[PDB]
Design an enzyme around this catalytic site. Structure first.
Site, PDB file in Angstrom:
ATOM      1  N   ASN A 164       0.832  -1.187   0.000  1.00  0.00           N
ATOM      2  CA  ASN A 164       0.000   0.000   0.000  1.00  0.00           C
ATOM      3  C   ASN A 164       0.878   1.254   0.000  1.00  0.00           C
ATOM      4  OD1 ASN A 164      -3.043   0.606   0.224  1.00  0.00           O
ATOM      5  ND2 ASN A 164      -2.036   2.197   1.437  1.00  0.00           N
ATOM      6  N   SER A 166       0.255   5.341   0.648  1.00  0.00           N
ATOM      7  CA  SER A 166      -0.771   6.266   1.114  1.00  0.00           C
ATOM      8  C   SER A 166      -0.147   7.490   1.752  1.00  0.00           C
ATOM      9  CB  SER A 166      -1.781   5.622   2.049  1.00  0.00           C
ATOM     10  OG  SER A 166      -1.237   5.392   3.327  1.00  0.00           O
ATOM     11  N   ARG A 169      -0.281  11.951   7.670  1.00  0.00           N
ATOM     12  CA  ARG A 169       0.588  12.919   8.294  1.00  0.00           C
ATOM     13  C   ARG A 169       1.538  12.236   9.276  1.00  0.00           C
ATOM     14  NH1 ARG A 169      -4.131  15.710  12.120  1.00  0.00           N
ATOM     15  NH2 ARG A 169      -3.360  14.819  14.078  1.00  0.00           N
ATOM     16  N   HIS A 187      -5.826   2.310   4.776  1.00  0.00           N
ATOM     17  CA  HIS A 187      -5.124   1.094   4.405  1.00  0.00           C
ATOM     18  C   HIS A 187      -3.869   0.948   5.256  1.00  0.00           C
ATOM     19  CE1 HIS A 187      -7.526   0.578   0.432  1.00  0.00           C
ATOM     20  NE2 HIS A 187      -8.125   0.014   1.466  1.00  0.00           N
ATOM     21  N   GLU A 229      -0.949   0.045  -5.020  1.00  0.00           N
ATOM     22  CA  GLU A 229      -0.998   1.303  -5.775  1.00  0.00           C
ATOM     23  C   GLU A 229       0.027   1.320  -6.909  1.00  0.00           C
ATOM     24  OE1 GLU A 229      -1.597   1.268  -2.500  1.00  0.00           O
ATOM     25  OE2 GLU A 229      -3.347   2.599  -2.257  1.00  0.00           O
ATOM     26  N   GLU A 278      -5.447  21.489  10.036  1.00  0.00           N
ATOM     27  CA  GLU A 278      -5.987  20.351   9.298  1.00  0.00           C
ATOM     28  C   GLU A 278      -6.775  20.859   8.093  1.00  0.00           C
ATOM     29  OE1 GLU A 278      -8.124  17.939  12.093  1.00  0.00           O
ATOM     30  OE2 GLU A 278      -6.271  17.147  13.077  1.00  0.00           O
TER      31      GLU A 278
HETATM   32  C1  LIG Z   1      -3.324  14.698   0.004  1.00  0.00           C
HETATM   33  C2  LIG Z   1      -3.328  14.410   1.479  1.00  0.00           C
HETATM   34  C3  LIG Z   1      -4.066  13.328   1.948  1.00  0.00           C
HETATM   35  C4  LIG Z   1      -4.159  13.046   3.319  1.00  0.00           C
HETATM   36  C5  LIG Z   1      -3.452  13.851   4.224  1.00  0.00           C
HETATM   37  C6  LIG Z   1      -2.718  14.990   3.770  1.00  0.00           C
HETATM   38  C7  LIG Z   1      -2.650  15.253   2.380  1.00  0.00           C
HETATM   39  C8  LIG Z   1      -1.847  16.397   1.799  1.00  0.00           C
HETATM   40  C9  LIG Z   1      -1.962  15.775   4.870  1.00  0.00           C
HETATM   41  C10 LIG Z   1      -0.760  14.942   5.328  1.00  0.00           C
HETATM   42  C11 LIG Z   1      -1.486  17.209   4.624  1.00  0.00           C
HETATM   43  C12 LIG Z   1      -2.950  15.934   6.045  1.00  0.00           C
HETATM   44  C13 LIG Z   1      -3.352  14.579   6.535  1.00  0.00           C
HETATM   45  N1  LIG Z   1      -3.576  13.575   5.614  1.00  0.00           N
HETATM   46  C14 LIG Z   1      -4.069  12.357   6.047  1.00  0.00           C
HETATM   47  C15 LIG Z   1      -4.824  11.564   5.149  1.00  0.00           C
HETATM   48  N2  LIG Z   1      -5.308  10.352   5.565  1.00  0.00           N
HETATM   49  C16 LIG Z   1      -5.090   9.831   6.821  1.00  0.00           C
HETATM   50  O1  LIG Z   1      -5.504   8.722   7.145  1.00  0.00           O
HETATM   51  N3  LIG Z   1      -4.347  10.600   7.676  1.00  0.00           N
HETATM   52  C17 LIG Z   1      -3.797  11.831   7.377  1.00  0.00           C
HETATM   53  O2  LIG Z   1      -3.122  12.396   8.248  1.00  0.00           O
HETATM   54  N4  LIG Z   1      -4.974  11.993   3.820  1.00  0.00           N
HETATM   55  C18 LIG Z   1      -5.958  11.303   2.937  1.00  0.00           C
HETATM   56  C19 LIG Z   1      -5.523   9.897   2.486  1.00  0.00           C
HETATM   57  O3  LIG Z   1      -4.259   9.947   1.825  1.00  0.00           O
HETATM   58  C20 LIG Z   1      -6.561   9.258   1.551  1.00  0.00           C
HETATM   59  O4  LIG Z   1      -7.744   8.985   2.281  1.00  0.00           O
HETATM   60  C21 LIG Z   1      -6.072   7.973   0.864  1.00  0.00           C
HETATM   61  O5  LIG Z   1      -7.155   7.281   0.237  1.00  0.00           O
HETATM   62  C22 LIG Z   1      -5.345   7.046   1.802  1.00  0.00           C
HETATM   63  O6  LIG Z   1      -4.808   5.954   1.007  1.00  0.00           O
HETATM   64  P1  LIG Z   1      -5.388   4.446   1.231  1.00  0.00           P
HETATM   65  O7  LIG Z   1      -6.691   4.385   0.495  1.00  0.00           O
HETATM   66  O8  LIG Z   1      -4.310   3.572   0.585  1.00  0.00           O
HETATM   67  O9  LIG Z   1      -5.487   4.199   2.733  1.00  0.00           O
HETATM   68  K   LIG Z   2      -4.071   5.195  -1.754  1.00  0.00           K
HETATM   69 MN   LIG Z   3      -4.659   1.761  -0.727  1.00  0.00          MN
END
Ligand SMILES: Cc1cc2c3c(c1C)C(C)(C)CC=[N+]3c1c([nH]c(=O)[nH]c1=O)N2C[C@H](O)[C@H](O)[C@H](O)COP(=O)(O)O
Ligand SMILES: [K+]
Ligand SMILES: [Mn+2]
Ligand SMILES: Cc1cc2c3c(c1C)C(C)(C)CC=[N+]3c1c([nH]c(=O)[nH]c1=O)N2C[C@H](O)[C@H](O)[C@H](O)COP(=O)(O)O
Ligand SMILES: [K+]
Ligand SMILES: [K+]
Ligand SMILES: [K+]
Ligand SMILES: [Mn+2]
Lengths: 500, 500
Positions: A164, A166, A169, A187, A229, A278
């Site tokens: 995976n 992803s 933060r 994930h 991915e 956030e």
């Molecule tokens: C673009 C982006 C996506 C963040 C994100 C940020 C950005 C810039 C940050 C880092 C600035 C602020 C926080 N983020 C988180 C986040 N998801 C999560 O579970 N925790 C996080 O802390 N996401 C969303 C996450 O990446 C999506 O839900 C994906 O689907 C996760 O991938 P997955 O399906 O493989 O789990």
């Molecule tokens: K993803």
């Molecule tokens: Mn995924």
């Protein structure tokens, strides 16, 4: 190629005049993030900080606002399009279609190559200290220096069948650990659970920054459970991604990563994490919680490594353009695969991407011989019981006349076609998104409920057909007249460029 | 003076460069309204049609978009400010304060003068035909030529103690009758009921067009039951309005009216009325209903009379700027008079002015020691059981940090601080506004319910105080840093006029 190599991407933003190189010293303590924040709030050019105070041994430059919006409406989404080998004038529809294209293709598995630029330099246990790097403090009340806002975590199921990528933060905890959010149903959390139930060791882990732009997009997208991915990105780009093995573990990372951390995600340890400014536009100072803990064992990096950084909060930044839009694309496909007549989906920025607008093929809806209450419950059940719907708290259904990519038209339809209460169905027994202030700092359960489906379809849209015309220039005047008016507009004395 | 004389108002828009004089022939059949519609959708200059095909014996020119918005943000509301003797850079707060100023002053009753410009010409029963005048067809599917979109109806209680000035639509029925909307709880309807219960005669009536701009503003405002608008306008302007008696009845009309119809509103007759392209942005073709019927006995008018016209529908026009904003001002005062700690109110245009945002003094709220459910029910009960709240279906409560005049900040707060369901109270047993499509063409009772109070106050706003900072440039960075960034913005290479 820009979409396969972060360095080329940066060079592409330069050539587009969508970049400002700042070569004078900039403090990673708030200054870089403040500049970036202002860019995001004004849709200015992406800042490239080439001279960051405290940069030590080629670590590191910063690019801010990597996936934020451009000022013009002609190339509004041009920075996202540069992630995907799309023209900079690409529409949202086109961007999301590209991100969805791989979902009915065979994956293209990655290609292992012996080395690449991310190996041009390395530091071990005894050589790096994460507290000495110019890690940004992104918001004044953040509970740590958030190194990780635009890299991808790489973890693999214990059985090896699923790797995976992803975004989640993470912040610096000490010389060789981060803490971060790892929360269901993500994930990274699902895999972290697999390892905790196996109980034998900490999770092999890498965190890669300045990854291939097409990869960071997929990283942000809720593609299905079990889907690697790397292979999805392979299929979407039409080319196998080249990866190199980590030095200290058997995971693979893109050959051209700007910076790579290698180490372990603990199955037993936690540490202070947050708060953080956030995506919904808030920080709750002092609100620190136990989060996941990562041990860092090695850093590899390109010469003159560039760290991307999301200075996230109020509109508009990567948490809106990518989280919202990519969740909306998956939700569109999910609905379609459940035989729901949804043509398009988008998360209005005006909703702080907490809504998704679903455009309905009302010809198909009519053939279904259903009702508002019925359709609403079905749509809600599909989306709010699925991971793709996690971040979305309000679905708004609209007919064929609404362009869901246009917030103003969504707001119009919502405000005028959905009767509060009667035309909505609330869902209290679904997973909620705790980061929304009204969830995690609100009056109810942080993790449950608070979701609604708001039906902005009008009654006849289920039966015989739209039975109104809009009271607008477009629809309340015949074509010859509109053409005459438009032709005479400046002649008469009124004010009258696409690009600008 | 512009605010007391429509002709001077027109001259003021000219001098402001906020006017386009069209001196070539323009068809009142759709053409004038189409031009006007485009102006309203683009915040262009007000069109003055000096040459309308079929203008007969000085009847009539048209000014469109009389109370619509200007392109610049510096003088966004300058056309409204020109109604009130306010500087064209006036804020909404200032405009609404001016409209409210009279509510704690003694009325200044009008002054009767023997004649004035509205008497420069007259036509009797045998001389005018309403079907021959260049009355506009404003939208292609309208059920009639809507002569009346920006005049004021003048009716008086049978006992003489209350003379009401109000805007309500009317269309030409035949050579000497109009039909129009007369619906509860509107003052024209309340007075019409008084006469129907007396049962002895039809209601003496006049409909005045190109009235004093300050008068047309008060006409649009839900000032209290029993209050004569002439005297309220007197007090708000600091000067007694001059009125002249109608020739054929004992009502009084502003001396400087561009055009006056005199006649009767029937207490027994009705006629086909509508449909009409309406403020919420729709027309339902073929949706014709029995409406009020007016007999016209005389027309008096100025030389070179100008008829104002609202080409209303999708944003932004007089039905948004005046109906929404003026209802919001009255609602603000109403709340205050019920000991509710509301500082400001506005109807977001994004909501198609179906919402009002209420800004709360949260210091006062804290002293109240109350809860969301409690406060929400109280606010809803006050506003939705009062005529001032008729057109408003959603109230959104926000704390002190939100500028309710800024739709983007209201939308942010609504989307992020109000948990759907739990943080809302629905009201089904209040009068509803049937013109909203989801009411009159929706799934429930056209005349009842469909209202909600959405609480976007956060929990600590009731107890100890706001407990977050915004993740924005303004709040997540210290002042010296923000000043440094702003000072260096262009030096670094970024893009950087109030007027534009
Ligand atoms: C673009 C982006 C996506 C963040 C994100 C940020 C950005 C810039 C940050 C880092 C600035 C602020 C926080 N983020 C988180 C986040 N998801 C999560 O579970 N925790 C996080 O802390 N996401 C969303 C996450 O990446 C999506 O839900 C994906 O689907 C996760 O991938 P997955 O399906 O493989 O789990
Ligand atoms: K993803
Ligand atoms: Mn995924
Ligand atoms: C500015 C404005 C206000 C309209 C209006 C229009 C405009 C341009 C039109 C003519 C273009 C479209 C329809 N209008 C109607 C209307 N109120 C009503 O009862 N019927 C209407 O048909 N209103 C709102 C109405 O004037 C306010 O609710 C006043 O408070 C009524 O005055 P009152 O309090 O004395 O009854
Ligand atoms: K509906
Ligand atoms: K009035
Ligand atoms: K709330
Ligand atoms: Mn009144």
């Amino acid at each position: 190629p820009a979409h396969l190599c972060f360095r080329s991407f940066v060079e592409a933003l330069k050539v587009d005049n969508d970049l400002v190189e700042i070569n004078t010293p900039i403090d990673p303590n708030l200054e870089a993030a403040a500049i970036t924040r202002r860019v995001c709030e004004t849709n200015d050019k992406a800042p490239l900080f080439n001279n960051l105070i405290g940069m030590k041994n080629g670590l590191f430059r910063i690019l801010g606002a990597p996936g934020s919006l451009r000022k013009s409406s002609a190339d509004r989404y041009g920075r996202l399009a540069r992630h995907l080998a799309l023209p900079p004038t690409a529409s949202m529809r086109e961007i999301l279609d590209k991100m969805l294209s791989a979902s009915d293709m065979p994956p293209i598995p990655p290609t292992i190559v012996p080395t690449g630029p991310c190996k041009e330099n390395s530091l071990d246990d005894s050589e790096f200290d994460l507290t000495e790097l110019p890690v940004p403090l992104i918001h004044k009340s953040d509970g740590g220096k958030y190194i990780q806002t635009y890299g991808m975590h790489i973890v693999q199921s214990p059985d090896g069948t699923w790797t995976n990528w992803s975004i989640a933060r993470a912040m610096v905890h000490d010389k060789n650990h981060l803490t971060g959010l790892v929360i269901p149903p993500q994930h990274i959390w699902q895999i972290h659970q697999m390892w905790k139930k196996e109980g034998r060791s900490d999770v092999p882990w890498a965190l890669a920054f300045g990854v291939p732009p097409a990869a960071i997009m997929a990283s942000s997208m809720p593609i299905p459970d079990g889907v690697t991915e790397a292979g999805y990105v392979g299929a979407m780009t039409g080319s196998s991604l080249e990866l190199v093995k980590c030095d200290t573990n058997d995971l693979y990372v893109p050959a051209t990563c700007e910076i790579v951390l290698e180490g372990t995600l603990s199955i037993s340890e936690t540490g202070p994490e947050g708060p953080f400014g956030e995506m919904h536009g808030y920080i709750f100072p002092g609100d620190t919680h136990l989060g996941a803990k990562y041990k860092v064992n090695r850093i590899t990096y390109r010469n003159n490594a560039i760290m991307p950084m999301s200075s996230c909060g109020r509109l508009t930044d990567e948490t809106h353009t990518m989280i919202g839009s990519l969740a909306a694309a998956e939700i569109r496909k999910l609905c379609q695969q459940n035989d729901l007549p949804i043509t398009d989906a988008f998360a209005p920025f005006e909703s702080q991407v907490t809504w998704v607008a679903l455009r309905v093929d009302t010809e198909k809806l009519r053939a279904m011989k259903t009702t508002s209450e019925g359709f609403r419950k079905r749509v809600g059940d599909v989306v709010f019981n699925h991971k793709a719907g996690y971040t979305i708290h309000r679905l708004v259904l609209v007919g064929d006349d609404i362009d869901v990519y246009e917030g103003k038209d969504v707001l119009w339809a919502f405000s005028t076609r959905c009767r509060p209460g009667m035309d909505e169905t609330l869902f209290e027994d679904v997973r909620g998104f705790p980061l929304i202030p009204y969830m995690g700092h609100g009056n109810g359960p942080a993790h449950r409920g608070g979701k609604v489906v708001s039906d902005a379809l009008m009654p006849t849209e289920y039966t015989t057909g739209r039975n109104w015309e809009a009271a607008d220039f477009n629809q309340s005047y015949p074509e010859d007249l509109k053409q005459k008016v438009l032709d005479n507009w400046t002649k008469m004395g009124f004010s009258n460029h696409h690009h600008h």
